[PDB]
């Protein structure tokens, strides 16, 4: 099983193996076209705009200037 919790650690303490895996994983992430792709995820933040408002207007999804941020 590959499960458990992920560990987020400091960047300055970069361990070569860790960095390699990240770079490779990121590379693959960037490559994939799928919805769980780099482009798709990035889209959530702002452009292209992912959010609909009921008028049909499109706006950036990220919540800023709010408690929810």
């Amino acid at each position: 099983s590959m499960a458990g919790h992920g560990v987020r650690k400091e960047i300055n303490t970069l361990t070569t193996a860790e960095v390699d895996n990240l770079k490779d994983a990121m590379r693959a992430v960037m490559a994939d076209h799928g919805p769980n792709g780099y482009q798709a995820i990035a889209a959530f933040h702002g452009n292209p705009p992912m959010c609909p408002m009921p008028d049909g207007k499109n706006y950036s999804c990220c919540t800023h200037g709010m408690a929810t941020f």
Binding site: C51, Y59, S60, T63, H64, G65
Partner: protein
């Protein structure tokens, strides 16, 4: 370096002294901007008060803070 317990202690220490603050009311200014403000005496002598930034862009959702930024 501080531990949680330590940090809390550190923070309280800050509380001990009186402080003066400038408060800003911020709302969506349709863009990202950097603000710098200085405190000036009547003389006109000024010193750099501080800086804060606003992240934004077109098609941002509208927002306004309920309270002031200190």
């Amino acid at each position: 370096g501080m531990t949680i317990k330590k940090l809390e202690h550190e923070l309280e220490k800050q509380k001990e002294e009186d402080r003066t603050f400038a408060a800003f009311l911020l709302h969506g200014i349709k863009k990202s901007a950097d603000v710098s403000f200085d405190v000036c005496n009547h003389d006109g002598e000024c010193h750099f008060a501080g800086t804060f930034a606003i992240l934004g862009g077109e098609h941002e959702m509208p927002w306004s803070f309920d309270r002031l930024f200190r």
